[PDB]
Structure formats: C-alpha cells, structure tokens
C-alpha cells in the first residue's frame, strides 16, 4: 500500500494500510484525539475525588490539578485551593469533547466513505479531498489548523489580560496582568537575551507574567498571519522547492525539496519531540509558568520525563520516518 519495504502487510504494522484511505485516516485521528481528551478529564475527576484541603497540592501527588490551579481555577489569595468544583467542570467538558471526537471517529471509520477520492463530485466532501503528493491540498489543512491554534493562544492571552486573569507568582494571587509588548525584548529570549543577561535556558528565564502574556499575543498574531499565508496561497515557493537536503536518494546535497507521506509525518514527529525538549527546559527552570506553590520546587523528574519523550520523538520517530520517506523518494 504505497510502500514496499519488506513487511507492508503485517498486522502489527496495519496502520500503514490507511496511508491513502483519507476517510479512515480521519476517523483514526479523531478516535485518537478521543483518547487524548478522555485521560485529562477522567484523571481530573479522580484527583478532585481524593483532594484534601489542608495539605498542599505538591504533597498530594496530583498531575493535572497543578496546571489548572496555575490558571486561577478554584484558588484564591495566597495560592490555596478554595473550591474544587471548577476542576470537576473542566473534567466533564473534556468528557464531552472526547465523546464528540469518538462519535466522529466511529462515523468516519464505518459509515463515512473510506476514500474521499470516491466522494460524489462536490458533495461538500470533495472539498476535503487531499493527496500526499499535491502541495496545494495540504496547504489549506496547515492553514486552518494554524487558525485554530492561533485562536486558542489569543484566547488564552485575552483571558489573562482582561477576564479573570491568571495566578501571578509575584503578586501572590489571581490578577488581570498588564501585558508587555516590547517585541525586541520578547524575541530576545529565543537567543537567551533575557534582561538580566544571557541565560542558558531560552524562553524559560521569564520572571514575570507580563513577558509570557506578551509572548502569547505575539505568537497568536504570528500564527494568524501564517494561517492567512497558507490558506490564501497554497503554492510552492523557492523556500520549500529548491532547498538543500542531504540524502542517499542522491548521494550528497540536492535542491529537490521532495514531498512524501512519511516525510510529512517525520517533520511533524520531529516538531513534537522538539516541543517536548523545550517543555523539559521550561518545567526545569521556568517557575513563573509553574508556581512551586502548586508544582513543588524540585521538578527534575517531570523534566526528565519530558526529555525522554522528546528524544524518542525527535530522534527515534523523526529519523525512522525521514529515512523511510527519503528511500520512498526512489519512485
């Protein structure tokens, strides 16, 4: 099925069988998202069930409550959990999202048409036809997903600034913090250029909520602009086409800029692993975004967990799928 390595039709590899089946692939992703959303809500409800008021969160071993309390959910002045009901509401809403995703996945795996190339010729569904070769098709997908991520980030920032704000570590309580919008100052962190001097952990030495909220505004605007870029153009440019790549497809650097299913998957996997490593640094050092009132002070274990996951995705998955895609570029 669009691959001939040695073992394409093995049951333990059977997911590759959906390489071209667009409808089934969409269903599979939706079901997976159902899993990813079931876990948080279920474990939040389980946590709130055993939560004790006198003891502090770091001493209760909660791995989802701290992230919710960091956003001012159910906490008051002094950083103590007051009311537990909003955590329960968050869990229930994740249950709802998971149920909707699972319904969609069941529809597209069984009721929906397996391959959208078999859609009835502009039936609201041919507009969703995509091919792992044509660039234009996948461009609009990237654009719309960027739209959603950007709207999420902007919503987070707007909530922080105007409505009910976040738990600011320095001010000791939940406040609508006034954002900092000095773009050079924000983008300096990416090279470690913190105001207090260069720092080893980029983006992680922020010492005030204003920096993070301004950065989120910047990221939201940037992602919205990129969404417009990809939705409105869909055409390959001399950046993607005609860029150097080293591969045994042709021994040595080439300017081909190849495209393939495994290659797209590999770039995505590498991106995820990189985010894992960046988050590792973040939770190791940045305690503005992780108030030790909630997550505790010692946080080497969580950072190491993130590190391992990031290495597995960036090195293992990224390399494996990149090599397979480059080899499949011998078609």
């Amino acid at each position: 099925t669009s691959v001939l390595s040695n073992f394409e039709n093995e049951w333990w590899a059977g997911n590759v069988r959906m390489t071209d089946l667009s409808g089934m692939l969409l269903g599979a992703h939706l079901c997976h998202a159902a899993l990813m959303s079931v876990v948080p809500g279920a474990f939040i409800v389980q946590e709130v069930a055993r939560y004790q008021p006198g003891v502090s969160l770091p001493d209760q071993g909660m791995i989802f409550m701290p992230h919710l309390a960091a956003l001012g959910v159910g906490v008051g002045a002094g950083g103590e959990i007051v009311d537990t009901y909003p955590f329960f509401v968050i869990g229930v809403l994740h249950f709802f999202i998971a149920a909707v995703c699972c319904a969609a996945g069941l529809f597209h795996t069984f009721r929906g048409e397996t391959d959208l190339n078999d859609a009835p010729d502009d039936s609201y569904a041919a507009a969703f036809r995509y091919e792992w070769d044509d660039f234009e098709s996948l461009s609009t997908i990237v654009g719309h997903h960027l739209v959603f991520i950007s709207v999420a980030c902007l919503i987070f920032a707007v909530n922080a600034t105007y409505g009910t704000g976040m738990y600011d570590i320095n001010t000791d309580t939940v406040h609508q913090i006034s954002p900092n919008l000095n773009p050079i100052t924000l983008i300096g962190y990416l090279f470690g250029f913190t105001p207090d001097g260069w720092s080893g952990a980029g983006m992680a030495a922020v010492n005030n909520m204003e920096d993070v909220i301004g950065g989120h505004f910047l990221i939201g605007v940037i992602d919205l602009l990129g969404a417009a870029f990809h939705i409105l153009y869909r055409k390959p440019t001399p950046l993607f086409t005609k860029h150097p790549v080293f591969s045994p497809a042709n021994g040595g650097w080439s300017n081909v800029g190849m495209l393939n299913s495994e290659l797209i998957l590999s770039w995505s996997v590498a991106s995820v692993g990189f985010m894992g490593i960046s988050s590792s640094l973040f939770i190791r050092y940045c305690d503005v975004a992780y108030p030790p009132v909630f997550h505790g002070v010692d946080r080497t274990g969580a950072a190491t967990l993130q590190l391992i996951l990031g290495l597995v995705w960036m090195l293992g998955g990224g390399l494996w799928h990149g090599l397979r895609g480059e080899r499949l570029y011998a078609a």
């Binding site: 010692d298 946080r299 080497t300 274990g301 190491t304």
Partner: protein
C-alpha cells in the same frame, strides 16, 4: 524526583547504548563492506 544514583543509571543506559551501537555498527558495516 531524580536522585544522583538514578541519573547515574540513566547515563549508564546512554553509555551502554553507545557501546552496543558502536560494536554492532562496526560488525554490520564491515560485513556489508566485503559483501
């Protein structure tokens, strides 16, 4: 939380992976060379 002993064990896994990888790579590469 990570302790020094656990970190040492993790570095052990790194070094052992490196050793095994270099040994296996040498063996397989040399076997492939004079096919």
């Amino acid at each position: 939380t990570i302790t020094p002993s656990l970190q040492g064990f993790f570095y052990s896994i790194l070094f052992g992976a490196i050793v095994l990888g270099l040994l296996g790579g040498g063996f397989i590469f040399f076997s492939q060379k004079d096919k």
